[PDB]
Design a protein around this ligand. Structure first.
Ligand SMILES: *[C@@H]1O[C@H](CO)[C@@H](O[C@@H]2O[C@H](CO)[C@@H](O)[C@H](O)[C@H]2NC(C)=O)[C@H](O)[C@H]1NC(C)=O
Ligand SMILES: *[C@@H]1O[C@H](CO)[C@@H](O[C@@H]2O[C@H](CO)[C@@H](O)[C@H](O)[C@H]2NC(C)=O)[C@H](O)[C@H]1NC(C)=O
Ligand SMILES: *[C@@H]1O[C@H](CO)[C@@H](O[C@@H]2O[C@H](CO)[C@@H](O)[C@H](O)[C@H]2NC(C)=O)[C@H](O)[C@H]1NC(C)=O
Ligand SMILES: *[C@@H]1O[C@H](CO)[C@@H](O[C@@H]2O[C@H](CO)[C@@H](O)[C@H](O)[C@H]2NC(C)=O)[C@H](O)[C@H]1NC(C)=O
Ligand SMILES: *[C@@H]1O[C@H](CO)[C@@H](O[C@@H]2O[C@H](CO)[C@@H](O)[C@H](O)[C@H]2NC(C)=O)[C@H](O)[C@H]1NC(C)=O
Ligand SMILES: CS(=O)(=O)n1cc2c(n1)CN([C@H]1CO[C@H](c3cc(F)c(F)cc3F)[C@@H](N)C1)C2
Ligand SMILES: CS(=O)(=O)n1cc2c(n1)CN([C@H]1CO[C@H](c3cc(F)c(F)cc3F)[C@@H](N)C1)C2
Ligand SMILES: *[C@@H]1O[C@H](CO)[C@@H](O)[C@H](O)[C@H]1NC(C)=O
Ligand SMILES: *[C@@H]1O[C@H](CO)[C@@H](O)[C@H](O)[C@H]1NC(C)=O
Ligand SMILES: *[C@@H]1O[C@H](CO)[C@@H](O)[C@H](O)[C@H]1NC(C)=O
Ligand SMILES: *[C@@H]1O[C@H](CO)[C@@H](O)[C@H](O)[C@H]1NC(C)=O
Ligand SMILES: *[C@@H]1O[C@H](CO)[C@@H](O)[C@H](O)[C@H]1NC(C)=O
Ligand SMILES: *[C@@H]1O[C@H](CO)[C@@H](O)[C@H](O)[C@H]1NC(C)=O
Ligand SMILES: *[C@@H]1O[C@H](CO)[C@@H](O)[C@H](O)[C@H]1NC(C)=O
Ligand SMILES: *[C@@H]1O[C@H](CO)[C@@H](O)[C@H](O)[C@H]1NC(C)=O
Ligand code: NA
Lengths: 728, 727
């Protein structure tokens, strides 16, 4: 009688989740945007004042994309003319507004096409990157000091990452790191001179007569990589008369012997910086701890303060070596590392001692360190109820490691099993964000006695809307394979009847350290397929999946396209044996790494799947970027792992596609998984005489996220699944 | 009896036999029988082995093709064949001395040679390598370099650039030997400021980074290549260190603006004719130039300059027609549009501006095939007033009233579409009948127009087809606005006019096209009619060829209008005939046909349920300058920009919500760029229209590789069958 959650509801965002995105400005206040007005809230009492009125920039003459208030609250950086580049990179125009004199600064403006801008962490200094060079402004109205002069489009990047460092190393375009009080500005320089370019057509508006060719320095597996250098500049001794001196910090000898990466930069104190370097064979990393020397004006990294992190079973870290969390004096730090059982736990290190002490342990993992005080370390883990797909906040007493308190486990155990946290400047307060299994819940807490101060947002408006919809349910459980539990989830249709046989769609990702079985609440395409179309949408975390230790995660080391593909087939075989699944109607789909796995599964000859959809799939590891691919596969050389690079392609399985219905989709402007990857799959299928369905998306990238393309792709895939399952 | 299936079509089960001969003289031809090259005596039919099947067993390479020198002393062997555009390719070549029975190992033709040609007499060679011309007087002797300006993608000497190859010459070659081989004439193209089309080429899966293919290609209204013309005396090569290439400049009427060199024809040993065309292609000038032995220059008397212009459209069918000179080179015959708009043969004196028409009537001359001192032979569609038929005629030069049809009555039931191949001095001729019955190849003597013998009658295929339920073909016309418009229908076997059949409209409809004819075909339509019981129809509406300029020039400056409307009207007319299921009318086309299909599907007519566009044009500004501007003029506000903008597929995207559409394009299409379909898909996505798509990796405009050909027709067959609810 009630309506179902339809494809139009998903595509038009009829049922919206409310958020509570705050920005901490001190240890007791935060900023929050309400009705376009920026308000300041007192954490203790919940009272607010207007920080900046929505009408302030009514005559600005530009649509403001974002804002950034200086740490001292005197200025506001206004971002406009936003032009997206890659996953994290973009260019924009900036204006600075003085909040005390209520005026826009008109002198010495930040230029247009600025690549990155950041306030110092204290006060109101600015550092920005323009034309691949770094500039520093001590005062917003004063002229800029040019820090670097070597910046060259597609070749020398100062203070910004190139394509592969942005995507695969830093998850950011910025390569600038201010010291804690803003004295020093540390930065990396990337050199892409001999990195080969990926080239692809961009069609643009119909008015463009000749297509443009986009050229991006992108190292594919085994190719020449960018090189890196690291520098530190004193921003307190800058001169208008003389050019700035940047002090270089060279990589340790164990890195300089061959290809390597800079993988982490973390300031320890006002005069101490730590850097982590990673070998191109990503199973060996080195942390250097460097001290400023006032007499020489140099940075010295003592060999007695060097820390090695290596792996004998795989690579180092989940995606990269983890960041250290230094104490106030910078003499020691806490870092998540894989223990002797292969589980990621917090280790406590002294800067000048080799052995660290694990402060946590068990067959579960620490996800992240969130805050550190002299008495407590706060962290997120999946310890609770032994559910790897759940997340809770804990605190550990630093004077007694046996004293671990869960801070979020029992707040609302039925509604909330997946949390993230935001602490105030000195951890006096924390905002907890519960993202499932129930509707998201945002709450504010004080650290002294872990008081639950108030509910910030409980999504009660959405809860009221959803009571009139026949919503699907979610089952999270496990199957046992070779004495190991592997978790899965199922999005079950409303009024689920275990005596009936439902078609099943296997939603796959299965990349290394992936997790597709979790307690998160989502309103997505699967919600529609289950609610309206009565399809079970299942996901499974097999070998190679994360947050369950290295025995599972490292099982696919040097062997992508093996165990993680076999385990999805095994999960479907097991689900197909369940009484509520129609074994004549099992489908599989995935995007990105999931598109590769879907294609490898469809080409396996298992006979389990009737049909499948691969969106922007990888097809051959030699076509993907060096940093990600080599982390798991090593090098594609006869002396390393070339035979497995050649055995793990989708193209080699083309003949096995004769038994399935396949839909292959890819954006023509995908800078990440190049269109080439799907162009080679289609050519191999054509060569063996296999019919299949295809769809290209003109000028769409890896996300196929423009409003019209997003609606079109999900509409096209819904027709395909429905046709496959004989659904009118 | 079995039907003609999709696998019969894709696997070439029912093969048409051909009879490809090569005339070597006035009475002998070469023919390949069991990989042996045989020489046949045309008069008696007796043969001998010219070159044994085993001669090149130990060559070390597969021989793609060969060419015998005109004097029969040498054979040019072509291998390492690498295809480029429609006509161009590169190859390696060896020369084999037929007398000495040995391969020439000294001063070999270089690898990556772009073009090679024997002189018309003897055994001189001219070849193009790295965009420069070279001449070898003797096959084993060093070459003489002719040009030093050749430069990849910039300067082309003796070879055409992309647009001249595709749209002007229909050939890669831009070299023309004089009749006895004394002179070598050539064109030089300069693409310096011509913009490049760029597209990815993925190659074998072993290629880690895709290649970017970059080709100088002028799109409509862009900067065009410029051209120069030269003549070199090859007999002076062994006497001078560096023989002068004498330039022949274009006339003043062409030099005032952008222009093209559109025809080169030698008249005598010392007289050459050149045709030039203005960028606005309704004005052409022919210059007739004589060698001046005293100065070593070429002079073109203004008294011998001929103007060909058009007030209703462009000049020529696709370009101005070539002249056929009398032996003394003082007069010539040329096909031109008469006062009534019908293409007929006109006879010109080289220094007189008014010509005399030698043929007339409401039909057209297709081509001049041979000219002797007493007769001119030509092909026309006069017979029975059928524009889709072709026959060979002979006209007495001393009396124009004496016109004999040589082929009309040979087998009128079986043969209504002929082409011909004459021996070197027209002593014999091979007739090639290509429909409506099975192709038939016959040999004839010109002395008495007598049939000598049947060369190939396709009796083996005839025997095979007797066991197959073959479709039939109807060729007829409908009267619209007091004008006859021809159509053809491929009808299912056992066609019953009381039954309602699904109909597929097979469209091309470009300017001067002809899709209704008498040719016998074994193709996709054969399978659709024979196995799936679908009527496959084609219609020749406004803009179609071979029926006069009133029909052909109707779409002048207005592509995407009458030729699109007339296809919609044809489907309504076929529905009126009573044997068509109006709920099951589909449309499909390739190239210009894909543009027309898309325009029809976006018209909002309601006539068509579904349609397939393969490699369509979507916007005339994306297509090349020479072809597009011939019909559309320039895309400027002063000329025809409003119509260029009004005739795109993209502007009709909203109307595609009413149909099922399949869009298909090869990614390495150098001709209709993938861009054209990339813009269609983007416009459909933008208005929220669901449709089907298929790209073909590394396939060009022909989607002709064996595997892609089989894949595309299989994919299209599934789509049409689903549209027509066929199991
Ligand atoms: C960026 O890297 C390139 C090398 O990839 C550097 O160029 C080399 O410079 C040295 C001299 O310092 C020459 O001997 C090499 O031949 C150069 N190689 C090439 C390929 O140019 C370049 O100097 C680096 N730039 C910066 C600013 O670090
Ligand atoms: C930020 O930290 C820096 C580094 O410790 C401070 O700079 C030092 O300040 C002391 C005291 O004035 C001097 O004796 C040192 O010579 C300074 N060192 C350098 C490298 O400049 C700086 O004063 C601090 N700034 C703020 C705002 O607290
Ligand atoms: C880091 O990576 C590779 C993983 O294969 C190890 O490389 C050694 O060299 C080749 C592989 O290229 C093999 O023949 C050796 O047997 C590998 N060594 C071992 C011990 O397996 C390398 O040793 C690994 N490093 C660490 C710290 O485990
Ligand atoms: C091909 O055409 C270009 C012009 O498009 C000619 O290049 C010019 O040559 C003159 C004389 O050397 C220079 O002064 C100009 O600067 C050149 N222009 C450009 C755009 O490069 C070129 O010489 C022509 N080539 C031939 C062989 O005719
Ligand atoms: C091919 O034709 C050319 C051009 O008419 C002939 O060359 C001329 O021959 C006469 C003698 O009959 C000479 O007086 C001229 O000086 C030649 N002209 C040139 C431009 O070379 C040539 O002899 C003919 N070749 C053959 C084999 O008959
Ligand atoms: C927890 S973290 O902040 O250290 N972290 C998480 C991720 C990363 N870092 C890196 N990110 C990866 C996600 O899959 C991406 C990805 C993987 C593919 F196999 C692919 F085909 C396309 C594709 F985009 C990777 N390029 C980056 C996931
Ligand atoms: C009789 S003739 O020898 O003078 N002659 C016939 C043709 C030509 N010359 C030129 N040729 C044309 C065929 O359609 C082609 C063609 C037309 C299109 F509209 C198109 F989208 C793609 C495409 F390849 C033209 N580029 C050339 C057809
Ligand atoms: C909140 O209330 C306190 C006490 O009344 C006051 O001092 C403070 O300024 C208020 N905070 C804000 C952000 O308005
Ligand atoms: C940014 O661009 C605008 C428009 O071109 C220009 O007026 C303005 O001066 C530019 N800003 C800076 C800081 O260069
Ligand atoms: C700073 O360095 C740049 C580049 O080397 C140079 O052009 C400029 O003149 C220098 N300025 C001073 C003050 O030396
Ligand atoms: C054909 O026959 C004639 C007369 O017998 C003979 O001289 C000639 O060599 C033959 N031709 C061929 C090509 O065998
Ligand atoms: C020569 O050609 C082929 C081998 O390529 C062979 O079948 C044939 O029998 C040979 N002999 C003759 C007389 O054709
Ligand atoms: C053509 O290439 C092959 C292989 O590189 C070489 O052996 C041969 O000599 C070349 N031919 C000529 C004429 O240079
Ligand atoms: C031959 O003459 C032409 C025209 O003057 C000249 O461009 C070329 O360089 C010359 N070649 C030589 C001297 O080898
Ligand atoms: C050629 O066409 C243009 C555009 O239609 C026209 O202005 C011009 O008069 C025509 N020229 C001739 C010679 O008819
Ligand atoms: Na409370």
């Amino acid at each position: 009688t009630r309506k179902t959650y339809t494809l139009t509801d998903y595509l038009k965002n009829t049922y919206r989740l409310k958020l509570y995105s705050l920005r901490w400005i001190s240890d007791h206040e935060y900023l929050y945007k309400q009705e376009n007005n920026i308000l300041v809230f007192n954490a203790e009492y919940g009272n607010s004042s207007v920080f900046l009125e929505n009408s302030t920039f009514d005559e600005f003459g530009h649509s403001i994309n974002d804002y950034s208030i200086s740490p001292d609250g005197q200025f506001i950086l206004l971002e406009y003319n936003y032009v997206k580049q890659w996953r994290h990179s973009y260019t924009a125009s900036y204006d600075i507004y003085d909040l005390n004199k209520r005026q826009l600064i008109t002198e010495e403006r930040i230029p247009n096409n600025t690549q990155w801008v950041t306030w110092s962490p204290v006060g109101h200094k600015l550092a920005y990157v323009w034309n691949n060079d770094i500039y520093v402004k001590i005062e917003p109205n004063l002229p800029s000091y040019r820090i670097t002069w070597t910046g060259k489009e597609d070749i020398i990047y100062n203070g910004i990452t190139d394509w592969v460092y942005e995507e695969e190393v830093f998850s950011a375009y910025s390569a600038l790191w201010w010291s804690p009080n803003g004295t020093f500005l540390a930065y990396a320089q990337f050199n892409d001179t001999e990195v080969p370019l990926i080239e692809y057509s961009f069609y643009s508006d119909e008015s463009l007569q000749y297509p443009k060719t986009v050229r991006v320095p992108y190292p594919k597996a085994g190719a020449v990589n960018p090189t890196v250098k690291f520098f530190v500049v004193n921003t307190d001794s800058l001169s208008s008369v003389t050019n700035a001196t940047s002090i270089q910090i060279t990589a340790p000898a164990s890195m300089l012997i061959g290809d390597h990466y800079l993988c982490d930069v973390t300031w320890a104190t006002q005069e101490r910086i730590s850097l982590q370097w990673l070998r191109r064979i990503q199973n060996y990393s080195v942390m250097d701890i460097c001290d400023y020397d006032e007499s020489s004006g140099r940075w010295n990294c003592l060999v007695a303060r060097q820390h090695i992190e290596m792996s004998t079973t795989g690579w180092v870290g989940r995606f990269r070596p983890s960041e250290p969390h230094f104490t106030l004096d910078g003499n020691s730090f806490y870092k998540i590392i894989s223990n002797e059982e292969g589980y990621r736990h917090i280790c406590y290190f002294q800067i000048d001692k080799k052995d660290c002490t694990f402060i946590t342990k068990g067959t579960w993992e620490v996800i992240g360190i969130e805050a550190l005080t002299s008495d407590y370390l706060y962290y997120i883990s999946n310890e609770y109820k032994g559910m790897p797909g759940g997340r809770n906040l804990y605190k550990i007493q630093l004077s007694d490691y046996t004293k671990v308190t869960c801070l979020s486990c029992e707040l609302n155990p039925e509604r909330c099993q997946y949390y993230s946290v935001s602490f105030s400047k000195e951890a006096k307060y924390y905002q907890l964000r519960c993202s499932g299994p129930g509707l998201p819940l945002y709450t504010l807490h004080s650290s002294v006695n872990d008081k639950g101060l108030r509910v910030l947002e409980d999504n009660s408006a959405l809860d009221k809307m959803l009571q009139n919809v026949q919503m699907p349910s979610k089952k999270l459980d496990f199957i046992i394979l070779n004495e190991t539990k592997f978790w899965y989830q199922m999005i079950l249709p409303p009024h689920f009847d275990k005596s009936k046989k439902y078609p099943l769609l296997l939603d796959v990702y299965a990349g290394p350290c992936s997790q597709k079985a979790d307690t998160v609440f989502r309103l997505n395409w699967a919600t529609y397929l289950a609610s309206t179309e009565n399809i079970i949408v299942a996901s499974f975390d097999g070998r190679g999946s994360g947050y369950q230790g290295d025995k599972i995660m490292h099982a696919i080391n040097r062997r992508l396209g093996t165990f993680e593909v076999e385990d999805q087939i095994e999960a479907a075989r097991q689900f197909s044996k369940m009484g509520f699944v129609d074994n004549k109607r099992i489908a599989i789909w995935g995007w990105s790494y999931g598109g590769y796995v879907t294609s490898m599964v469809l080409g396996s000859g298992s006979g389990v799947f009737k049909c499948g959809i691969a969106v922007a799939p990888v097809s051959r590891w030699e076509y993907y970027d060096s940093v990600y691919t080599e982390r798991y596969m090593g090098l594609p050389t006869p002396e390393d792992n070339l035979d497995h690079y050649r055995n793990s392609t989708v193209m080699s399985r083309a003949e096995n596609f004769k038994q399935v219905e396949y839909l292959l989709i890819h954006g023509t402007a995908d800078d990440n998984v190049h269109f080439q990857q799907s162009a080679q799959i289609s050519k191999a299928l054509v060569d063996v005489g296999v019919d299949f369905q295809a769809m290209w998306y003109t000028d769409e990238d890896h996300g196929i996220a423009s409003s019209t393309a997003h609606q079109h792709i999900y509409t096209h895939m819904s027709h395909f699944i429905k046709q496959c399952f004989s659904l009118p």
